[PDB]
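User: Structure tokens for this complex, please. No commentary.
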Amino acid sequence: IEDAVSLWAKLK
Amino acid sequence: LLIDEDYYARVEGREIISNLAKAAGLATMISTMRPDIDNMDEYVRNTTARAFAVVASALGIPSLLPFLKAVCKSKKSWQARHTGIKIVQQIAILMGCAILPHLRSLVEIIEHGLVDEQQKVRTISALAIAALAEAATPYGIESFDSVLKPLWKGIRQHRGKGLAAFLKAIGYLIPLMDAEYANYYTREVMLILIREFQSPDEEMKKIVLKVVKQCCGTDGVEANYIKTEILPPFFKHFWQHRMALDRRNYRQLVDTTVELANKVGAAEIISRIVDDLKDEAEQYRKMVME
Amino acid sequence: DLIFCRKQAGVAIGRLCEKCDGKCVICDSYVRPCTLVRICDECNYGSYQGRCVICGGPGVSDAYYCKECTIQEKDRDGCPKIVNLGSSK
Amino acid sequence: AEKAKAGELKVVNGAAASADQTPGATPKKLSSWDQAETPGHTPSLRWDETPGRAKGSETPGATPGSKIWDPTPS
Amino acid sequence: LLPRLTPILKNRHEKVQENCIDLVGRIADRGAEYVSAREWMRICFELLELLKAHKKAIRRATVNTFGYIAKAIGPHDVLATLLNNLKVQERQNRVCTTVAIAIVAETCSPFTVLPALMNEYRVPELNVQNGVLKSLSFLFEYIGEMGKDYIYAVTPLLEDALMDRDLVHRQTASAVVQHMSLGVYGFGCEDSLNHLLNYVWPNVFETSPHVIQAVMGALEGLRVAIGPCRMLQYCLQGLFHPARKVRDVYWKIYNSIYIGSQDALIAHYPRIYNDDKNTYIRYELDYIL
Amino acid sequence: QSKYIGTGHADTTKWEWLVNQHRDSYCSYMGHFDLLNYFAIAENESKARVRFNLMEKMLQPCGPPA
RNA sequence: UUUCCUUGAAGCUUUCGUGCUGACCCUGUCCCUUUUUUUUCC
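Assistant:
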């Protein structure tokens, strides 16, 4: 769950 | 494969090292590839650089900077720094005209080399500055700025491959200056250039050659002066059968002589090399001819 | 392996070699040249001065666009300087 | 962030424990300084690979704590 | 001279075929009266198999010559003669012949030639059928504005070919729709083009790369001819269709419509009823003075 | 396509598609001088207060997502 | 108001077979791989 949170911060 | 004599070999190689590096993750690539930096063999370093060049073309410089900038400040050993600097270079060559924006940062790495105690690190370093400028063309001059004042001084005191290297830089600088400031500084170099035509080193003759292209390749330089000091040496030591048999030197030569024409006129040059169409050996003739 | 650079469209006139010479670049075609090619000196520089926008040889002429790609307005997208799989330069 | 300096004494210490002496690691760590205020999760990403992603959480977590806190108390 | 050349054309070897056909071209362009017709028609029946050339440039100037003489004589024969040629060309090798049919069809009023051509799509032999289709393709690409006429002639034919026999019919034909659709632009012949749009449309779905990038060709051009609003009226229902397959595509289309002419659309989004958390009705347009 | 905004894909939500066409409605309304003036006339304001209002409604329209 | 035939599609897995598509392809092309523990003497 963690990494895709920073990935989604990279998205928006 | 990337460091490949064959032209099509290389280009394949680069293609796939991007495809991998972008394909894998950045931190993958890094966490992977440190230890090859200090690997005893110079080969694996060398190549390891050109790798980092490619992965950098993939993932952009600024991603990767803080890493590099870390490397060149590694205080354990130099061998790294020799590498990290090299990296700067092959970045230069590959990314080329596009280096422009982070130029200032990159340089802000590399300056701390030039003063180093170890030699190579000096050497390679400067060499990079060159390559940079050569992608810089007529740009970012003052970003290189804080670089010079060592360089000029360094020019004075040297013996050897490093020396001419620093030229390789300065030469690629001059086009980037103001022909008043460039004026002065030019006037200093064309001397050392003179005294140095004569070396046996070929790395040399390539260098000093390409320089003249630039120094006397200038708008803000005066015609007669070339006509006197340079030419007679020039045609003396360079135009010789050593040279033209080799490939590069052939070209680089032709270029240079051409630009001395674009300035001092035509009949001057052509006058001196006409008499050599009738010299026997071909490749030579071919050269004068073209 | 072979696709556009599509970096921004500068003022630099395009340059094509012998081979490529007739071709409207994207429509691949000889038909109805009308309007003119621009690429980024990033794409076009140095050894690329007068270099082919395709093959890597010296440019002897200047690609004209078709009219077909014109009314479909594609000529105005990123600079069509083809990058191959390997580093362009 | 002069305690980013003496901090460098800390970071150096802890990582140096977690194999000895590795340099440019420590520098890829602290090399996120100069964007100050701006350093993030991605630190755990990159560093996450370089060290064994296990110790990762441990360290960069501890760091983010000491950084937010000593970011306050100044 | 010119006859003295003529027999060389067998020469097999390259550099010959190049400089020769080049030469023959210049001269049959410029002078071209000097030489009695009979000689030419010998030249024709010799050219025809220069189209075995491995090389592009040969075929290139080859064609352009084929035209030059076709001017010198007059058309019917030279297409009648081209109709016979390129039977065994492998995988698109013959096409260059078609390119003759095209350039020819310009260099006297194509307005002459069609009936011959059209009729020749009757022939049961499949691959020459599709051949004639491309003939129309390059044909419109080379004529442009003029299409405002013979469009009608082709339209029913495009209906037949466009209806299946096989893919290839639909592929190549559809290409015809493209170059036509650009060329006509905005002279007012849309109506028919609308009509054709129908028999095109279903083709949308397939994996076959050539068929698809063909169709993308079609609908793009057709956009400029018909205008969006009509298009978009084929692309509404598709967007949200439950299935994946359809949504994949109708989206790919609606994009292609969308990038160009984004400025136009606004009018053509239909009214859409606003739900609880949101307002999807754009109230502006209904302000009435 | 992706870096060209307004691109869709088959996962496109209702909401997003509609908000798109809102915004584009707007950069048109700022665009087409007349159309703008039309609005201004109807609901009495400045040209400006119009454009201003619009550029408020830009990010919002329809209200929050789902 | 009872006690009876033949047929028919697919889909998946197989390195059989044959047509065909891109003005693809069949000629461009060599150029910064040049790397070593600094070490060329009025």
